[PDB]
């Protein structure tokens, strides 16, 4: 019925773990991230993966992406930058990658419906396999949930940012997204952790 991604694996151990639970995972490259790995290391993880594994990056220009895809043999990419729809399509046509495009939830301003219309317009510029909404922190988070809830009615989105076993349940029947993306919420000491993932999954696994 749904889609769970566990993002930001850095080792084979972490990867084989998430594959027991998640519908997809991700390896971060060329980004500002505690989870960044070098391209070669990403390549090795991508080679052994049994589920979809996204090449996750904030890379902004096509050659950067083209080169990363070439070195990793990624079949999936998560585009976590405002890269032009045409550049995305180029990567799709020239490399056969499937794309999840990440969108920051805009907070400014000030009614959730207005940011949602600004985001819907932005989303509709893209021709991509999946849409990921990256929610933020602070009290502005409930605003992000409402924005995301509007969006999730027009597209089967993947809800992301700040999800934990303790808050994902609320997140889900608030936004009712098609999927959820989790990274640090299932890490014990920066390592993908089984009991946390199971606890996270236990909340998801109800429909
Ligand atoms: Na293990
Ligand atoms: Na088990």
Curated annotation (Swiss-Prot):
Its EC number is 5.3.1.24. Gene3D superfamilies: Aldolase class I (3.20.20.70). Keywords: Amino-acid biosynthesis, Aromatic amino acid biosynthesis, Isomerase, Tryptophan biosynthesis. One of its GO terms (molecular function) is phosphoribosylanthranilate isomerase activity. Pathway: Amino-acid biosynthesis; L-tryptophan biosynthesis; L-tryptophan from chorismate: step 3/5. It catalyses: N-(5-phospho-beta-D-ribosyl)anthranilate = 1-(2-carboxyphenylamino)-1-deoxy-D-ribulose 5-phosphate. This is N-(5'-phosphoribosyl)anthranilate isomerase. It comes from the Archaea. It comes from Thermococcus kodakarensis (strain ATCC BAA-918 / JCM 12380 / KOD1) (Pyrococcus kodakaraensis (strain KOD1)). SUPFAM superfamilies: Ribulose-phoshate binding barrel. GO terms for biological process: L-tryptophan biosynthetic process. Belongs to the TrpF family. The keyword Acyltransferase does not apply.
